């Protein structure tokens, strides 16, 4: 006779992400060659790692400034891809479509002051576990930190290390979260010399081991 089969219940339905491919209906279509078309990207993170985007500060400014020349906290932000300061970055734009992440996140600092202005900054990673962020360089010194001068090289880069209990972390932040789960990043100005109106532009990119997993379509549609 013919082949006996059992149509199984629970299977066959359409799944928006199944690996099946439909049946072709119009064949033998040859398309104009696309070999060597400039600017192709095959992985979102390749782009995210090579193109830092601007952080968003006080009044939609991609930089911080200071009038006093004493020690002061220039900025403090949550180490979250959902942080306000990251809201306009490409990294966060990409991250919103993934449930989890892990890895290094790079911060880029660029001094825009004149030649006659010098400054010394410090950036620190404050892990979760403390009630409030350190308001002074002294206190923050005990954390993982870096300090630098502004000379011929006006650009500096710092890696925010992935340090959590779990091997992965959520990209979104739950309303339950009181204090940020992944800690904070603090940018201090140790001191400066005649740099009152000069600014420090900050941007962020993905680190060599930054990784996103578990795609999601969360936006309200």
């Amino acid at each position: 006779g013919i082949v006996p089969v059992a149509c199984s219940d629970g299977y066959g339905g359409l799944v928006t992400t199944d690996p099946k491919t439909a049946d072709p209906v119009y064949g033998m279509v040859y398309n104009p060659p696309r070999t060597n078309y400039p600017g192709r990207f095959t992985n979102l993170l390749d782009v995210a790692e090579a193109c830092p985007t601007f952080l968003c500060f006080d009044e939609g400014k991609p930089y911080v400034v200071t009038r006093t020349d004493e020690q002061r906290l220039l900025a403090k932000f949550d180490v979250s891809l959902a942080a306000k300061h990251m809201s306009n970055t490409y990294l966060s734009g990409i991250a919103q479509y993934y449930a989890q992440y892990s890895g290094t996140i790079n911060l880029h600092f660029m001094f825009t002051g004149s030649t006659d202005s010098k400054a010394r900054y410090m950036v620190a990673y404050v892990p979760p576990g403390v009630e409030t962020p350190p308001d002074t360089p002294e206190k923050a010194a005990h954390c993982i930190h870096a300090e630098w001068d502004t000379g011929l090289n006006s650009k500096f880069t710092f890696s925010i290390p992935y340090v959590s209990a779990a091997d992965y972390a959520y990209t979104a932040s739950d309303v339950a979260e009181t204090t940020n789960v992944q800690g904070w990043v603090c940018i201090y100005q140790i001191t400066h010399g005649k740099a009152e109106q000069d600014t420090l532009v900050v941007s962020v990119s993905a680190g060599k081991d930054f990784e996103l997993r578990l795609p999601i379509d969360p936006r309200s549609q």
Binding site: L14, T16, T17, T21, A22, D23, P24, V25, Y26, V29, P32, R34, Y37, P38, G39, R40, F41, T42, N43, L44, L45, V47, E49, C51, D78, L81, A82, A83, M86, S87, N88, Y90, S92, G93, I94, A95, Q96, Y97, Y98, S102, T104, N106, I144, S159, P161, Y162, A172, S173, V175, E177, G207, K208, D209, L212, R213, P215, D217, R219, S220, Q221
Partner: protein
């Protein structure tokens, strides 16, 4: 590129499979504005949807298509550049109604080597030739599109929801009951 090695750390291994362009774009998405006669235009996807936003985060693209259509009466597809009147004849790829819907594989048929999500000039709006053809049926209830073998060129801005809370965008994350 800087690493955590600068201060004694150790860079780990990364699995970027999920951020691979071809993979991420390869899934069904809805098209909301529908009519008995509909021209397939990927820019009709939602601007914040997983695929819609990623597509708009690129200047040029290419891909074949796969579509799902829940319709009444028979469905007829016509290639890019065909007269609208052609949709009325069975000589063109026509699929006879079979519940619950029809799933087809369509090839890229634009006359251009690649298409664009933005076009600075005249053929605002995009050129009429930027389409994957048209489909017609007595009534079209739903339409899902899927980008097969996708290729993206020249990235453009991609935005997350803007934050007002001045610190973090918080939202209900799934968690067990009780």
């Amino acid at each position: 590129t800087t690493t955590v090695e600068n201060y004694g750390g150790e860079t780990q291994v990364q699995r970027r499979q999920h951020t691979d362009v071809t993979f991420i774009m390869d899934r069904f998405v809805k098209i909301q504005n529908l009519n008995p006669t509909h021209v397939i235009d990927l820019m009709q996807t939602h601007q914040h949807g997983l695929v819609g936003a990623l597509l708009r985060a690129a200047t040029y693209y290419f891909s074949d298509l796969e579509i799902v259509v829940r319709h009444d009466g028979n469905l007829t597809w016509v290639p890019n550049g065909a007269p609208e009147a052609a949709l009325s004849n069975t000589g063109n790829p026509t699929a006879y109604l079979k519940a619950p819907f029809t799933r087809l594989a369509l090839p890229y048929t634009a006359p251009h080597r690649v298409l664009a999500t933005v076009y600075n000039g005249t053929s605002a709006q995009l050129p009429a030739s930027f389409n994957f053809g048209a489909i017609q049926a007595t009534t079209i209830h739903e339409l899902l599109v899927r980008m097969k073998r996708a290729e993206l060129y020249c990235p453009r801005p991609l935005l997350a929801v803007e934050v007002s809370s001045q610190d973090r965008h918080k939202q209900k994350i799934i968690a067990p009951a009780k």
